[PDB]
Structure formats: structure tokens, C-alpha cells
Amino acid sequence: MEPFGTDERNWTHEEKDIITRFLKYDKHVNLKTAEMVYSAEVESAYFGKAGALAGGVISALFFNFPIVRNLPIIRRSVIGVLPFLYCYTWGKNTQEELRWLKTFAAYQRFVVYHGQHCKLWV
């Protein structure tokens, strides 16, 4: 149903959220596709939480690293938060990536279920 091509606009955050909530709660979605979206939502949050927690744990140690512990406060804080920022970004990006990939798979399943893709037929 979506336009296809290089010039086409990539899926925005609002479009992704709308399509996710459509797949979760609509009446025209079969139980398998809705279960796919639900399982996507269930497993994804752990990745963001774990990324944030691991970044917080590492940056607590990295704040006292042999060179970092002997730097002026501003540079010490920036270098210490660099692991936290990287790990938090990794967790959030991985959570969003997993959730959106399985949601897009569910969207493809919905489209094929209702025959809304040309050049796709049984």
C-alpha cells in the first residue's frame, strides 16, 4: 500500500506508531498478525532497559578509569558519559529496530492477507 522507490519518504515516527497501533487493535487484523505485533512489543523493551542499565554500570566504572580519574571535572564527566550515551543509544536503537522490523513483517502479513499488494497473489 505504501509507495515504493528511492525518492519515496521513509517511514516517519508518527506513521510507524499509527501502523503499529492499527495492527494491534484493528478488527481486520487476524490473530496471528496481532500476536506477531504483541510479541514484538514484549521482547523489545528489555533491550532498551538493558542498554541503559549497562551504560550506567560501565560509566560508573569509567568515571574512575586510570586516566579519567585524573582529569578536570568537565572532561572527566564528558568522557565518563561517553560509554553511557553509546550504550543507551545502542539499547534504544536496538529496541526500536527489533520492534519495527517485526511490526513491518506483521504489516506485510496483513497486506498479503487482505491482498493489498500488486504482483502478489496465490
Partner 1 sequence: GLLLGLSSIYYLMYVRLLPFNKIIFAWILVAMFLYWLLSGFVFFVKKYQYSKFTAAIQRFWKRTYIIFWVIEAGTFSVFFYLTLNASSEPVYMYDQIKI
Partner 2 sequence: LFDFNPSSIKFEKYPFYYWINSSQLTEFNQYRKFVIRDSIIYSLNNYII
Partner 3 sequence: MDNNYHFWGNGDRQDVSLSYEDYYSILDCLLDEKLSPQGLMKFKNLHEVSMYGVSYVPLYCFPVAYGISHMLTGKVRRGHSGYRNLFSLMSVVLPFTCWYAYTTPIPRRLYTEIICSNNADGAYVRNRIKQQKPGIWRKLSQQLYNKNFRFPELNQDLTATEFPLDYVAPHKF
- Applying CB under 8 A, the residues found at the interface with partner 2 are 1-3, 7-9, 12, 14-15, 18, 22, 114-116, 118
Which residues, 103 to 122, sit near partner 1 by CB under 8 A? 119-121
Amino acid in position 74? I
Q: Which residues have a Cβ under 8 Å from the Cβ of 27 and sit 6 or more positions away?
A: none
Spell out, one character per residue from 62 to 101, where the chain touches partner 1: x when CB under 8 A holds, - when not: ----------------------------------------
Question: What is the Cα–Cα distance from 91 to 94, expressed in whole angstroms?
Answer: 5
Q: How many Å apart are CA 14 and CA 4, to the nearest integer?
A: 19
How far is the C-alpha of 65 from the C-alpha of 99, rounded, in Å?
Answer: 35
- 4 near partner 1, judged by CB under 8 A: no
Contact of residue 5 among ligand PC1, partner 2, partner 3, none (CB under 5-8 Å per partner type): partner 3
Nearest residue to the partner ligand PC1, using Cβ: 86
Binding residue for ligand PC1, selected from 86, 92, 105, 109, defined by CB under 6 A: 86
Which partner in partner 2, ligand PC1, partner 3, none is near 86 (CB below 5 to 8 A by kind)? Answer: ligand PC1
Does residue 80 interact with ligand PC1 by CB under 6 A? no
**Cα separations (Å) of 91 from 25, 33, 54, 99?**
27, 25, 9, 12
Place of cell 536503537: 93
